[PDB]
Ligand SMILES: Nc1nc2c(ncn2[C@@H]2O[C@H](COP(=O)(O)OP(=O)(O)O)[C@@H](O)[C@H]2O)c(=O)[nH]1
């Protein structure tokens with residue numbers, strides 16, 4: 001789970017990490033009005049999207065750059081009106097972009113040098129790692145590719161934790177000299193503590209800044225949180241606006257149904273991420289385009305199949321539904337009835353293909369054939385694919 | 394070192410299994426299916442309820458209490474995620490040879506701690522978390538996979554996905570090849586067993602003549618396994634290997650950070666060609682895994 005910059009910045013502020021003092025403006029005029037409440041020489045404006053590369057982005061309004069700075073508050077609002085509502089298209093987002101809504105108006109600070117820094121859980125390092133480069137900025141990936149040996153890695157022991165020598169060496173490798181080496185090293189340790197405190201899979205500050213006045217500041221905040229840790233990170237997961245993605249995705253989450261959309265007419269429905277992806281794959285092999293897919297995992301509940309069909313069919317772009325449940329805990333002859341009832345108490349005007357395989361499937365598909373509803377069972381995976389594609393003519 | 398405990402992955406009918414979270418809803422279910430399939434389940438555990446009888450088997454408070462009193466050599470875990478990480482450490486403290494954690498949703502930070510000490514000991518081998526389990530067709534069944542699609546055969550299966558694993562198992566049984574040993578390593582990034590560990594067992598298992606590896610986009614696990622076969626499965630005794638990677642049609646995710654790219658340098662074309670370079674037959678269709686491994690035997694006259 002990713003949070004906006006302003007939401008992360010406060011987490012960093014309340015945990016000893018220094019960052020620019022800012023104001024969140026919902027409207028376009030309130031961006032410049034907040035630029036006055038702040039009162040500072042140079043102001044910085046940032047579009048809030050759950051993505052990076054904002055600086056090198058392009059708005060659908062023709063605005064070049066997702067981040068700008070100036071000394072005139074009147075200019076802040078001038079750029080805010082033509083930022084809010086439009087889609088910012090950075091190289092991390094799809095070609096369409098991300099609709100901007102909020103804007104951050106912070107106290108811009110002069111930058112004497114930029115360094116990249118990131119804390120994260122890496123499978124190769126079997127735990128937390130310090131990842132930094134002295135030449136950071138928006139061009140970090142290019143510097144990391146052409147000059148791979150400017151990327152410094154320092155594996156952290158989860159039991160012992162961040163050692164003073166590790167933080168001191170990282171700061172040195174980032175080129176923090178003199179008294180700043182102590183300051184940067186301390187901010188590194190404070191970031192690692194916040195990293196573990198919030199169950200974050202990634203904490204990235206780019207650029208890990210160094211002001212001409214001798215201050216080490218985190219100018220950018222990109223945090224990826226561990227979804228599995230939500231049960232102990234209530235306040236953190238309550239911040240997710242949830243309104244950037246389609247309102248059907250989070251509605252599907254009301255019943256623990258992981259949903260993602262696509263561009264097609266076949267609405268898939270599978271009990272497993274890997275299998276559900278292969279489902280969308282073999283459909284592509286047969287000339288069909290999956291509209292989306294619902295993932296159940298392993299648990300099977302009547303309430304889910306009743307809603308499931310509701311969500312997929314609520315998408316007017318659906319012309320058929322493909323059920324592929326291979327390994328449910330419930331004698332899926334039971335959910336097989338849940339498919340007949342979910343369809344009867346809903347009718348639906350689109351065909352429906354089903355492929356079940358598990359605890360006594362012989363009797364399970366007997367309920368479907370003698371039901372009287374547009375249900376066409378399938379024997380194997382390749383079978384369900386061809387039938388789904390054929391039913392959209 | 395930890396690699397020593399690889400051997401404990403190959404269960405048989407002599408392995409005496411116990412269930413952590415026995416009285417739980419899932420622990421109760423799959424324990425029944427385990428006993429019905431013929432698995433040697435000798436009891437389970439649930440804090441505060443040690444001493445009662447569940448499914449005709451004893452219930453204990455702790456693993457050591459259940460182990461020494463039943464001679465268990467394998468333990469399966471259905472504890473909820475918040476306390477699943479602890480259930481694993483208890484088994485390691487009890488020095489259980491094989492621990493299979495089915496629970497999904499364990500915080501990565503917890504598993505980083507579990508894996509930290511796990512790699513400092515060679516007595517306990519872990520599978521998972523967030524995995525279907527391991528099954529020796531006909532002999533032992535530790536996990537949630539449906540046992541009515543498994544025939545003891547000649548093909549060893551290692552899968553990173555979940556329900557997708559059942560496709561290869563089902564398909565390999567129809568063509569008549571059956572399965573020698575199916576193992577699901579799970580989806581969580583910090584787990585106790587990877588592709589290489591299972592490839593090490595399959596290549597060293599005479600009963601395993603063909604191999605099927607089921608991965609998917611994300612990470613570099615598929616590339617790592619590819620480089621292993623390039624070193625240990627090349628030349629004279631080259632066992633045929635088949636694979637399918639799910640998600641080659643999936644869209645590209647919405648990123649937020651430069652860290653991922655800097656560490657990678659990932660999915661589909663990368664994993665496919667890399668796997669192929671090691672000499673493995675990558676099936677493009679998920680439904681044509683059994684048909685592929687079969688003809689690979691026919692091409693080499695192994696049927
Ligand atoms: N001089 C100066 N430059 C800034 C300031 N804030 C941001 N920038 C510039 O804006 C660029 C992009 O900033 P940011 O939004 O944090 O990074 P992103 O993840 O690429 O969007 C940085 O690389 C800096 O060059 C500032 O306060 N002072």
Ligand SMILES: [Mg+2]
Pocket residue numbers: 052053137138206207220
């Ligand atoms: Mg950045």
